[PDB]
Coordinates of C-alpha atoms and ligand atoms in Angstrom, one line a residue:
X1 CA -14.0 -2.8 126.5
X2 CA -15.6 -2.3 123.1
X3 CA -16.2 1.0 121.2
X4 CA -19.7 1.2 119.8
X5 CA -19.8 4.3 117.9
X6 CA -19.8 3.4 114.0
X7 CA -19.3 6.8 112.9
X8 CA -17.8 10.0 114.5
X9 CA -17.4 13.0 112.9
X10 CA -14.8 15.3 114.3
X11 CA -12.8 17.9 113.0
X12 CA -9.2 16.5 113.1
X13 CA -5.7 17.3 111.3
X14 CA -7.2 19.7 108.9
X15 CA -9.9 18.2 107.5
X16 CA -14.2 16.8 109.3
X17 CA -13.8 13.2 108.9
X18 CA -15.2 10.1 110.5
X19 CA -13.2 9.0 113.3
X20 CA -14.8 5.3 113.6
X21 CA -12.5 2.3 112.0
X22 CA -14.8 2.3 109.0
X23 CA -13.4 5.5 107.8
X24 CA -16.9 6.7 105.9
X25 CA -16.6 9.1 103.2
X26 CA -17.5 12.8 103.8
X27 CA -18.3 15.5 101.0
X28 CA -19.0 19.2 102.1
X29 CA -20.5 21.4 100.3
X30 CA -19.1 25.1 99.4
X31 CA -21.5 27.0 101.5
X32 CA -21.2 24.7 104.8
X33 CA -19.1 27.5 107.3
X34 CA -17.1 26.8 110.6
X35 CA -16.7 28.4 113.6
X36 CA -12.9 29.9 113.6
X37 CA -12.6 29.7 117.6
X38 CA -13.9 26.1 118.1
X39 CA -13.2 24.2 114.5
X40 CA -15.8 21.1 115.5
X41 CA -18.8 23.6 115.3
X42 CA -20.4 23.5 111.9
X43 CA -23.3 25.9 110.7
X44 CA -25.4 24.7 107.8
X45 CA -27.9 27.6 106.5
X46 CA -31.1 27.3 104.2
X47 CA -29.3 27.0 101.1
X48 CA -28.6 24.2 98.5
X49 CA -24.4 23.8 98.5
X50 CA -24.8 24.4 102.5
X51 CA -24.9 20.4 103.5
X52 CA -22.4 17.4 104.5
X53 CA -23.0 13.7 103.1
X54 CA -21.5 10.7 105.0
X55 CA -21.6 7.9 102.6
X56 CA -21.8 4.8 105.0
X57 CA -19.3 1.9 104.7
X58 CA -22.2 -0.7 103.3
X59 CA -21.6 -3.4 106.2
X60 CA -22.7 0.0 108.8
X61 CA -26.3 0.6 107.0
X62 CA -29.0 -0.1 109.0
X63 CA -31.4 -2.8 107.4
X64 CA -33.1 -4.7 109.7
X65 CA -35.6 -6.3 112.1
X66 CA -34.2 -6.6 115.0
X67 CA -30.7 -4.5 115.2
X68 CA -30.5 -1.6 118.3
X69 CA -28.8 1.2 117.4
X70 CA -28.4 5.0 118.6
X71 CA -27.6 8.1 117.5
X72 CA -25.7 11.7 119.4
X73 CA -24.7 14.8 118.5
X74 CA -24.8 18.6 119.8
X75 CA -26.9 21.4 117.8
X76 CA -27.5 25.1 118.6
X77 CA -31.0 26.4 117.3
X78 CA -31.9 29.9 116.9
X79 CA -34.9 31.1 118.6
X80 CA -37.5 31.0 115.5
X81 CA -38.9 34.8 115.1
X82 CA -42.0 34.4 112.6
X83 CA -45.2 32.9 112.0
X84 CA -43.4 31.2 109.0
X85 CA -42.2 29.2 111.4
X86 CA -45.2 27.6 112.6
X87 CA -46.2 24.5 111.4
X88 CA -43.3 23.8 109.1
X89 CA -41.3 20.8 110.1
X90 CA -37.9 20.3 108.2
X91 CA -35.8 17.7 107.9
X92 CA -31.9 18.6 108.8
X93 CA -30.5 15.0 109.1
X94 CA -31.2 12.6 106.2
X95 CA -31.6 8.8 106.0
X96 CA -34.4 7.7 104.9
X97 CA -35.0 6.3 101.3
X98 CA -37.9 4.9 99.6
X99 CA -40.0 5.8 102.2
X100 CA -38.2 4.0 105.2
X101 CA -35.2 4.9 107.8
X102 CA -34.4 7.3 110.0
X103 CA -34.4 11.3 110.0
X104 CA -33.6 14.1 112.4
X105 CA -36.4 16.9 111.9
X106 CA -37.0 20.2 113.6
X107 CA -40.1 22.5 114.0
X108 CA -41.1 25.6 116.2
X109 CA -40.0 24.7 119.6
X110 CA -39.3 21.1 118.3
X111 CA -36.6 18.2 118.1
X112 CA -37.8 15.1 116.1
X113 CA -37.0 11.3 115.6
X114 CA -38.8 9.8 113.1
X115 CA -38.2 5.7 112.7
X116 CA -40.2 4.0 109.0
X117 CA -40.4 0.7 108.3
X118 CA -40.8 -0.7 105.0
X119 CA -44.9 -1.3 105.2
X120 CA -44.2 2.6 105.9
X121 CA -45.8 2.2 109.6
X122 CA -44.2 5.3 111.8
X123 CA -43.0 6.4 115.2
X124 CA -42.2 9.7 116.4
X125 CA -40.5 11.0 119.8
X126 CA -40.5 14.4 119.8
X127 CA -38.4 17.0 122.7
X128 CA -40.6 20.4 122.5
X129 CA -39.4 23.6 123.9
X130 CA -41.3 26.7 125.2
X131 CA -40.4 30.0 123.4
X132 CA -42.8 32.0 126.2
X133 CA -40.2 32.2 129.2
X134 CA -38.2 33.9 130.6
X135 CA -35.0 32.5 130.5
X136 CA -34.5 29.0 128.1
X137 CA -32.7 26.6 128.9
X138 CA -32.6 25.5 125.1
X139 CA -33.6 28.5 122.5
X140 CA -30.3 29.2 120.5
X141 CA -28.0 27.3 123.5
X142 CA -26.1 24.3 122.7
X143 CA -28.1 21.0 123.6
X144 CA -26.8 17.6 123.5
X145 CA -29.4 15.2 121.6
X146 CA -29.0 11.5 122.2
X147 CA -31.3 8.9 120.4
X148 CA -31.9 5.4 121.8
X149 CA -33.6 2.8 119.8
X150 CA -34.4 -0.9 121.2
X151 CA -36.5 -2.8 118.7
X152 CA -38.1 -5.2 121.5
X153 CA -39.5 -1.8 122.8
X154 CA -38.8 1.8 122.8
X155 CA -37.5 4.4 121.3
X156 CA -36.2 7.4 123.2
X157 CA -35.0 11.1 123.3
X158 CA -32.7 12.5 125.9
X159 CA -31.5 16.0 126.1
X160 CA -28.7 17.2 128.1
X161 CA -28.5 13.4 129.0
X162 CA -32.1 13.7 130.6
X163 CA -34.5 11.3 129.2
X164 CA -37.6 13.3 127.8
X165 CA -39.8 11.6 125.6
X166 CA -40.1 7.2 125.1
X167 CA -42.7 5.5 122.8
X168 CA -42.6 2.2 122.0
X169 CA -41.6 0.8 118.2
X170 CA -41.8 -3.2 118.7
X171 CA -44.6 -2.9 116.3
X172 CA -42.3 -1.7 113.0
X173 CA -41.0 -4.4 110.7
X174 CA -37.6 -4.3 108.5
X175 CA -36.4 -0.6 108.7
X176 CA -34.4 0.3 105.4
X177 CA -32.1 3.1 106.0
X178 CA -30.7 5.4 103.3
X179 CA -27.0 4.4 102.5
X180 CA -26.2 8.0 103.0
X181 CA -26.6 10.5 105.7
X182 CA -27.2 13.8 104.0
X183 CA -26.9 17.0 107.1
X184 CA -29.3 19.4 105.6
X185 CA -32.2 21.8 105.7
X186 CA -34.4 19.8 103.7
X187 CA -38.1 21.9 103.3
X188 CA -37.7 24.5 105.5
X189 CA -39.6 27.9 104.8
X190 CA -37.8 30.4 106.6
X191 CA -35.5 31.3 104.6
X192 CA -32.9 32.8 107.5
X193 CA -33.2 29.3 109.1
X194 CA -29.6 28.1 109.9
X195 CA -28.2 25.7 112.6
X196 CA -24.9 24.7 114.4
X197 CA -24.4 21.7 114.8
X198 CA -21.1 19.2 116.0
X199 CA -19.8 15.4 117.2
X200 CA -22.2 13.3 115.2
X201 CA -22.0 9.9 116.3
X202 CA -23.8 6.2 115.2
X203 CA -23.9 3.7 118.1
X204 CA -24.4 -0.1 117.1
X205 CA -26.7 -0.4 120.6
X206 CA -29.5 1.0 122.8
X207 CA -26.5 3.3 124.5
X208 CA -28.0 3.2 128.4
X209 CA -28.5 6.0 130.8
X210 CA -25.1 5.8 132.1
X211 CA -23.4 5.6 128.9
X212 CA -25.1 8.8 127.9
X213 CA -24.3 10.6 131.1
X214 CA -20.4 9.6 130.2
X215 CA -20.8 10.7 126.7
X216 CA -22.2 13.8 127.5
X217 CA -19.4 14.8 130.2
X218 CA -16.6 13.6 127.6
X219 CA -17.9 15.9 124.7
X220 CA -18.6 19.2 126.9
X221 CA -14.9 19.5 127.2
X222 CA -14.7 20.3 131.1
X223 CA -11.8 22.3 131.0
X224 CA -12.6 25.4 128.6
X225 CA -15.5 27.8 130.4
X226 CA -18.2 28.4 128.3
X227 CA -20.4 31.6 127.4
X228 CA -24.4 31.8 127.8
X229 CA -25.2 30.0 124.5
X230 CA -22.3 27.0 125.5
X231 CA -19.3 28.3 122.8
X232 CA -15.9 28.8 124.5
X233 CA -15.8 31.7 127.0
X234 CA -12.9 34.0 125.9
X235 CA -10.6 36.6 126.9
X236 CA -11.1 40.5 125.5
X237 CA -15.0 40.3 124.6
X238 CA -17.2 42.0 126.0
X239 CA -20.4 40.3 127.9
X240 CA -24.0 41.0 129.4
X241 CA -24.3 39.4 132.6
X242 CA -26.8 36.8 134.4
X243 CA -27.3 36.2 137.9
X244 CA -28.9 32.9 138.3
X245 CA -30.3 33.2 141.5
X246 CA -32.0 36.9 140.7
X247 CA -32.7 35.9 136.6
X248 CA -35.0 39.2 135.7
X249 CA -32.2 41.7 137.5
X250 CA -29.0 43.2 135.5
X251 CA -25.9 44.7 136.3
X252 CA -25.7 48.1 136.5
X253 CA -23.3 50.8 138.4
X254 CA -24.2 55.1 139.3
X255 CA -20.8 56.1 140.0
X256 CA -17.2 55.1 139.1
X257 CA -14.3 54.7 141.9
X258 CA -14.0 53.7 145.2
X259 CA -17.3 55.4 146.7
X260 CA -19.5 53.7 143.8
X261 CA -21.0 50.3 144.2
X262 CA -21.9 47.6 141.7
X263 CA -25.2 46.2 141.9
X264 CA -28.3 44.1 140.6
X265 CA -31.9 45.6 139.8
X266 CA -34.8 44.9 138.1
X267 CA -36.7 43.7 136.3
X268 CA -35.1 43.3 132.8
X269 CA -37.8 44.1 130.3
X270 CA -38.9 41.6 127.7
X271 CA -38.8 41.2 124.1
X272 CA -41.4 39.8 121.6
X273 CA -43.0 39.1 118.8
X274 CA -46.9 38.4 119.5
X275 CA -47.5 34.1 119.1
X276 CA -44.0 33.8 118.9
X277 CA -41.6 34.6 121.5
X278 CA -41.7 36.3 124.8
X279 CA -38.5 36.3 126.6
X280 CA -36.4 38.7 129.2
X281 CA -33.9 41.1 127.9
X282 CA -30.5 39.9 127.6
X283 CA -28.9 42.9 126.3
X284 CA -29.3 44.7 129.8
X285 CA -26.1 46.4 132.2
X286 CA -23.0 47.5 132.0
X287 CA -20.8 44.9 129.6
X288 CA -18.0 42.7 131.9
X289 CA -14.3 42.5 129.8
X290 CA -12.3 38.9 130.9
X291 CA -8.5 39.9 131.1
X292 CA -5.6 38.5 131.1
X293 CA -4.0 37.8 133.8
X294 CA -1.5 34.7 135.2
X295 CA -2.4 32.5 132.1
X296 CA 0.7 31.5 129.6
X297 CA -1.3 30.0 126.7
X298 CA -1.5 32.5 123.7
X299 CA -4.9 31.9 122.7
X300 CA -8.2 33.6 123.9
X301 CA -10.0 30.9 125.3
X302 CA -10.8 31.0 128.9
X303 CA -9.6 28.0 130.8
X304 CA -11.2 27.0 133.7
X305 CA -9.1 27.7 136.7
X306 CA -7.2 31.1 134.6
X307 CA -6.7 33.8 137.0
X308 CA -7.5 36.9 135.5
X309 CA -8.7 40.4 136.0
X310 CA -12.4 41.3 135.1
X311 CA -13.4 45.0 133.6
X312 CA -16.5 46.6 133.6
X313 CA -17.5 49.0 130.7
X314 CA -18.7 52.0 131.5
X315 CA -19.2 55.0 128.9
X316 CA -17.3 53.1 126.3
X317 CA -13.8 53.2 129.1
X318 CA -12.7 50.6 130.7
X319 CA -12.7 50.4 134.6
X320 CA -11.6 47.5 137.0
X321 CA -13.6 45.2 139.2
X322 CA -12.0 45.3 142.6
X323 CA -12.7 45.8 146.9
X324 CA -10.8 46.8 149.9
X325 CA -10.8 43.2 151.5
X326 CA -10.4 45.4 155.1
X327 CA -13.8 46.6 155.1
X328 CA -15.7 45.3 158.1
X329 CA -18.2 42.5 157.5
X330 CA -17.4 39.1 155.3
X331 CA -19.0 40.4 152.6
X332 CA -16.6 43.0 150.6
X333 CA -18.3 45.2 148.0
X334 CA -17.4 45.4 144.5
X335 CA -16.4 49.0 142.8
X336 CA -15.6 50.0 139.4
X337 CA -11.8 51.3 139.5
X338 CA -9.8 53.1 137.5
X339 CA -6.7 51.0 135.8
X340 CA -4.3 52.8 137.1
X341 CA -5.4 53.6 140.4
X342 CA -6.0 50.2 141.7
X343 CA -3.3 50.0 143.6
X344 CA -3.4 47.0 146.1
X345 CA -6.6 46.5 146.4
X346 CA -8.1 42.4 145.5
X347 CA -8.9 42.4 141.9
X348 CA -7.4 38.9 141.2
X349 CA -10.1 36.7 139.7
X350 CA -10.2 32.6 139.6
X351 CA -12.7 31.3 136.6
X352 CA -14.4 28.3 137.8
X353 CA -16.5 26.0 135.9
X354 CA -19.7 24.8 137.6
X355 CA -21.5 21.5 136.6
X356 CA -25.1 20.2 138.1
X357 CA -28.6 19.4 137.6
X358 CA -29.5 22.7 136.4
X359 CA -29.2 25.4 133.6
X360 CA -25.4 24.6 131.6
X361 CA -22.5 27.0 131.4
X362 CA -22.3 28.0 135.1
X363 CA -19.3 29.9 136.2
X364 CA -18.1 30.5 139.6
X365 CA -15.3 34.0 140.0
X366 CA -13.8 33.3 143.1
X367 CA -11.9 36.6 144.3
X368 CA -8.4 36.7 146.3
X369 CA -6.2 39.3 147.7
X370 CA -2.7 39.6 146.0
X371 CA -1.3 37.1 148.4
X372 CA -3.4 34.7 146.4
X373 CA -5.8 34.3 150.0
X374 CA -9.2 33.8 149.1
X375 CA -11.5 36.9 149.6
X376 CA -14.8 34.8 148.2
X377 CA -17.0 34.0 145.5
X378 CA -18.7 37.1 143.6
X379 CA -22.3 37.7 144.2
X380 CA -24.5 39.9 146.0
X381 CA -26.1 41.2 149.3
X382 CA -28.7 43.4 150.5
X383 CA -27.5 46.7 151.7
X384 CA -30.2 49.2 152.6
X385 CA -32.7 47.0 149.9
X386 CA -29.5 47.7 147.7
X387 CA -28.9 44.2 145.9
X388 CA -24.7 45.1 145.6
X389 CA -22.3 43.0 144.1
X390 CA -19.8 41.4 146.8
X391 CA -17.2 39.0 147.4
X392 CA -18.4 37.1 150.3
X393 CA -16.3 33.6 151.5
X394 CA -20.0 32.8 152.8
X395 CA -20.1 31.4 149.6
X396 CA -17.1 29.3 149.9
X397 CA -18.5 27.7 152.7
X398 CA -21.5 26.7 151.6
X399 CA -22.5 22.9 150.4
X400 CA -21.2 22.3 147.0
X401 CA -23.9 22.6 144.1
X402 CA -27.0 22.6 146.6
X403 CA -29.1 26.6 146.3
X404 CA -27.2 28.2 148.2
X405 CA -24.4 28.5 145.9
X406 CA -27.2 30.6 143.1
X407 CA -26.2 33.4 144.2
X408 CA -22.4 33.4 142.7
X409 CA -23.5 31.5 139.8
X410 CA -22.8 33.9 136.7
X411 CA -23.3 33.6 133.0
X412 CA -21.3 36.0 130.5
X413 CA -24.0 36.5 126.9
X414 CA -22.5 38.1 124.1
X415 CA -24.4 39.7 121.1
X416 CA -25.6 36.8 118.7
X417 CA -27.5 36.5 116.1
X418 CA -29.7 33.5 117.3
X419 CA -31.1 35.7 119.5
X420 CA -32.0 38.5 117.8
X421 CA -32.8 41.3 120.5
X422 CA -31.6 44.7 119.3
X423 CA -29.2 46.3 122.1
X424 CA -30.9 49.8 123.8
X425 CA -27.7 51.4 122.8
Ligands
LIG501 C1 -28.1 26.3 160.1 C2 -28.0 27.7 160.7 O1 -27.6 27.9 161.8 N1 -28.3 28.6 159.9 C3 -28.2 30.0 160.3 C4 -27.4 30.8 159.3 C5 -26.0 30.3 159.2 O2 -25.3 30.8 160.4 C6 -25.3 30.7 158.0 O3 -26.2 30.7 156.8 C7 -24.0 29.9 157.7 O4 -24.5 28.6 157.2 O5 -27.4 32.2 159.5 C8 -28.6 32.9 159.7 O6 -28.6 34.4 159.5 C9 -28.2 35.0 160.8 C10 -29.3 36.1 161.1 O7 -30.5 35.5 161.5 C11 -28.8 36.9 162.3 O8 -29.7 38.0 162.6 O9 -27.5 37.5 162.0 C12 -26.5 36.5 161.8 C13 -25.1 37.1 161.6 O10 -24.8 37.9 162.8 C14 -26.9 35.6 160.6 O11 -26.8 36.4 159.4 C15 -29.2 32.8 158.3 O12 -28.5 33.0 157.3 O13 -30.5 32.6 158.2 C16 -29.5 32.1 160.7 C17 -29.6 30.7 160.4 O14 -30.4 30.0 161.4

């Protein structure tokens, strides 16, 4: 019944500008770039002219004693690769002045709030991250960040709208905030450091856990399928592919037509850099290709719900995912086919997005015959300790988002240079 963002930055009718009645002022500077797919995602790199200021309506900055307030918005961090890294926090969102406010601040493996009062008396919450593991949840992925702040008590961070850190801050006094908000890499070393970064939003309240569970839904934008690192899936690019249920196997195939088999093995490999990072391979298997299919919109965005084809690259040609649906058993295994010899066999693939507890940017390929009949989700089963890929309507029938549903989980991961493995070939 009551908005209580103060500020919302969104990319709207050709031009980043504060959605919120106030209407603040926003000045980019000439090296700031934007994603040309998804125009809300903003990359700001280690250099001077690469930086946004808001200049805050005056009634809107924070002075006070007593006032609760929080802030959201979604970044996308790549994975730090030196030891220039370590120990070097930097400031990336800017409002303090004079010694008291607010800030944003990153470091290896590290989110950070910072709240200063004026008798310059601090509190920190901090989210860290693990760069030894296997698979992140959070190194170069999009993360949503909220901030809560109740001056009677605490101060908290949640991530993916999952509180992680609270300490208390009844003890700071009047907290003078900067009557700007400068986005910028402010003391960073590395100078390679860049970070993504969209929907920055001021709340004028302590947003509860339900409010942030809302916001988050609202600003994943449900309907639009989303690669590894959470950017829009799309049509004609080729992707590595992750099993969630069997994490340190890839995709690989032998043999081409209707007698060859896709399957999973293992493990992946890893890649590293000694005191830094130590991760499984991404860049493992033979690449997937999303086609199109049924859907009418021009674009190359993947909706969820599209029906497409899927194309697996092998030798630099093009082959097609499909099964004969009459082989005995419920669980039909996939071959690599060529185009034009297909025929009438099940290739038709529904995209489904997948939303729980767990890891972000599930997606579900639910395979039909070309009577539109569903022939299952796509995922895998032991044949002769063989891990092939199937379409199996055991899936289908399972319980909705509980572990048994792993198994035809999938994630597409392009090339990107937050990541920063080197491909085999
Ligand atoms: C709750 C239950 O009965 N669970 C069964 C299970 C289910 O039937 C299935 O997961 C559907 O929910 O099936 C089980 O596996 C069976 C094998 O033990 C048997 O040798 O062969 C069966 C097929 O002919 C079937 O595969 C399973 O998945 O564990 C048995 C389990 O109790």
């Amino acid at each position: 019944h009551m908005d209580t963002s103060i500020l919302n930055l969104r990319y709207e009718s050709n031009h980043l500008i504060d959605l919120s009645r106030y209407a603040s002022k926003i000045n980019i500077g000439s090296k700031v770039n934007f994603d040309p797919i998804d125009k809300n995602q903003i990359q700001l790199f280690n250099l001077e002219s690469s930086k946004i200021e808001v200049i805050l309506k005056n009634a809107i900055v924070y002075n006070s004693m007593y006032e609760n307030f929080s802030t959201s918005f979604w970044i996308r961090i790549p994975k730090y690769f030196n030891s220039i890294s370590l120990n070097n926090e930097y400031t990336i969102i800017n409002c303090m002045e004079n010694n008291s406010g607010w800030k944003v601040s990153l470091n290896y493996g590290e989110i950070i709030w910072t709240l200063q009062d004026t008798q310059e008396i601090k509190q920190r919450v901090v989210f860290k991250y693990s760069q030894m593991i296997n698979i992140s949840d959070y190194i170069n992925r999009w993360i949503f960040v909220t901030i809560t702040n109740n001056r009677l008590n605490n101060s908290k961070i949640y991530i993916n709208g999952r509180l992680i850190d609270q300490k208390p801050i009844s003890n700071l006094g009047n907290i003078h905030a900067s009557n700007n908000i400068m986005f910028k890499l402010d003391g960073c070393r590395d100078t390679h450091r860049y970070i993504w970064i969209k929907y920055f939003n001021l709340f004028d309240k302590e947003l509860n856990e339900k409010e942030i569970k809302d916001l988050y839904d609202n600003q994943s934008n449900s309907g639009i399928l989303k690669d590894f690192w959470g950017d829009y899936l799309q049509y004609d690019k080729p992707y590595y592919m992750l099993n969630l249920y069997d994490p340190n196997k890839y995709v690989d195939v032998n043999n081409v037509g209707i007698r060859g088999y896709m399957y999973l093995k293992g493990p992946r490999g890893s890649v590293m850099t000694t005191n830094i990072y130590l991760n499984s391979s991404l860049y493992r298997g033979t690449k997937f290709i999303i086609k199109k299919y049924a859907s009418g919109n021009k674009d190359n965005i993947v909706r969820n719900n599209d029906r497409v084809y899927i194309n697996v690259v092998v030798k630099n040609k093009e082959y097609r995912l499909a099964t004969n649906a009459s082989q005995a058993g419920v669980e039909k295994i996939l071959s690599a086919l060529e185009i034009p010899d297909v025929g009438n066999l099940s290739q038709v693939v529904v995209m489904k997005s997948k939303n729980d507890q767990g890891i972000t940017n599930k997606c579900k390929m639910n395979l039909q015959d070309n009577n539109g009949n569903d022939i299952g989700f796509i995922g895998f089963h032991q044949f002769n300790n063989i891990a092939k890929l199937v379409a199996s309507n055991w899936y289908n029938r399972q319980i909705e988002r509980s572990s048994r549903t792993l198994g035809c989980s999938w994630e597409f991961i392009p090339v990107d240079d937050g990541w920063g493995e080197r491909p085999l070939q």
